[PDB]
Amino acid sequence: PQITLWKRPLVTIKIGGQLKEALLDTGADDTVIEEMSLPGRWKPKMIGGIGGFIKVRQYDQIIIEICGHKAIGTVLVGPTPFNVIGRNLLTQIGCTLNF
Amino acid sequence: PQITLWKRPLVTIKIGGQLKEALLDTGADDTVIEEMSLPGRWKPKMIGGIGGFIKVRQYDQIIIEICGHKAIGTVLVGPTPFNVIGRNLLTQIGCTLNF
Numbered sequence A, B: 001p002q003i004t005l006w007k008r009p010l011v012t013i014k015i016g017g018q019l020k021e022a023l024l025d026t027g028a029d030d031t032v033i034e035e036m037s038l039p040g041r042w043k044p045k046m047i048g049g050i051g052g053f054i055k056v057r058q059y060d061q062i063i064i065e066i067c068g069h070k071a072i073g074t075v076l077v078g079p080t081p082f083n084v085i086g087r088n089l090l091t092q093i094g095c096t097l098n099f
């Protein structure tokens, strides 16, 4: 669909069969989500945000549905203000910016 | 235009007579720019994201030129790692997310 930006672009996503609210974030290279349980091993990763760097747990090939579209990619778990859907997954659902 | 998200959606903008590179950011409520001089009054503000909060100076009714467009609105100036064009200005140029 088409999402205008007068309000935060918050959508419903599904991870591990559980529904959650997330933000479509074109300014984030990666997808960062709140603490939750995920399958498999994770590896270390540091990301730089507006306030500085933080450590997160990186889980690859995680199945995640975004507003109906299924994607399978890297998800980072850590202390984030919002569940953020970054470019790595926005590209998977064919999301683009238009104006 | 239609901007794909394979890479960071960076654009050149003109603010306060200065040219700067900036990131089109749907995850940002407002526009935040690196330290620079801007006309008019301002008030302190704290904004947070990944990594925590930073203090910025809020200036209202600031004019910015972006991709052939002239947008007007609030601009926050502070120690941001990236210059980001937020929703407050993205809406003014008719930016939307599509998939």
Ligand SMILES: Cc1ccccc1CNC(=O)[C@H]1N(C(=O)[C@@H](O)[C@H](Cc2ccccc2)NC(=O)c2cccc(O)c2C)CSC1(C)C
Pocket (backbone or CB within 6 Å): A023, A025, A026, A027, A028, A029, A030, A031, A032, A047, A048, A049, A050, A051, A081, A082, A084, A086, B025, B026, B027, B028, B029, B030, B031, B032, B047, B048, B049, B050, B080, B081, B082, B084, B086
């Ligand atoms: C920018 C602004 C303006 C007004 C009010 C609050 C804020 C702060 N908002 C935010 O920080 C929001 N974030 C955003 O809007 C993001 O697009 C953010 C932009 C950015 C990039 C480089 C330096 C600094 C900022 N990007 C990242 O944090 C980011 C950047 C690179 C990789 C990565 O995995 C991530 C998560 C993600 S967390 C958030 C949804 C709260």
